[PDB]
Design a protein around this ligand. Structure first.
Ligand SMILES: CCc1cccc2c(C3CCNCC3)c[nH]c12
Ligand SMILES: CCc1cccc2c(C3CCNCC3)c[nH]c12
Ligand SMILES: [Zn+2]
Length: 195
């Protein structure tokens, strides 16, 4: 009834990477290693790097899923709020209820789990472009952390899993997410609070 969040590199040495975008007021997406937390604006591009030590097999996929970070909310499905699920902003592929979208990948598949009712989005794992050392997936988060009737100011985690063609686990990584109007300011504030 709750997805595992345990970091697991597995046989291929799977882990995530993030750009260094800084904390200027104008920044739209920024990652805090000290907090393991991504701060981003609504529906803006969030580049996430996929690193392995060796190439996994053809048919390997990469899934993203959100869960609530607090234990007392973790069995609740993370979904878009009653406003945003009705604002008709679909890309023609993502169901309007899904918080997490993949941008610019026509092979993205969106799952509503028949047993758990959780949402996820999965894409084929592709090797890096010639000249690149990793593959980047572009995610969008489609509600604010503060949306009433949705996340309702509750923190979430994104869990990224590397899966074989059957959906079996090959690797797992995760990060906290705050979707907010001013990611740069909020990252600076939370990093200072931590210090
Ligand atoms: C990373 C999964 C993948 C995609 C496309 C081709 C290959 C080969 C060859 C190994 N693995 C692959
Ligand atoms: C997970 C995405 C992905 C698929 C296949 C290969 C890679 C690499 C490296 C692995 C070591 N040799 C160069 C590509 C980073 N990321 C990958
Ligand atoms: Zn919302």
């Amino acid at each position: 009834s709750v997805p595992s969040q345990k970091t697991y590199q597995g046989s291929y040495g799977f882990r995530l990477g993030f750009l260094h975008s800084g904390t200027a007021k104008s920044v739209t997406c920024t990652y805090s290693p000290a907090l393991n937390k991504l701060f981003c604006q609504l529906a803006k591009t969030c580049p996430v790097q996929l690193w392995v030590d060796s190439t996994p097999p053809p048919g390997t996929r990469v899934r993203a899923m959100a869960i609530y970070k607090q234990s007392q909310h973790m069995t609740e499905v993370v979904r878009r709020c009653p406003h945003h699920e009705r604002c008709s902003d679909s890309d023609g592929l993502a169901p309007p209820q899904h918080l997490i979208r993949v941008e610019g990948n026509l092979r993205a598949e969106y799952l509503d789990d028949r047993n758990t009712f959780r949402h996820s989005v999965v894409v084929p794992c592709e090797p890096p472009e010639v000249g690149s050392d990793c593959t980047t997936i572009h995610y969008n988060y489609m509600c604010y952390s503060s949306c009433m009737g949705g996340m309702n100011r509750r923190p979430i985690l994104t869990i990224i899993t590397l899966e074989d063609s059957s959906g079996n686990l090959l690797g797992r990584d995760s990060f906290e997410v705050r979707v907010c109007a001013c990611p740069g300011r909020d990252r600076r504030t939370e990093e200072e609070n931590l210090r």
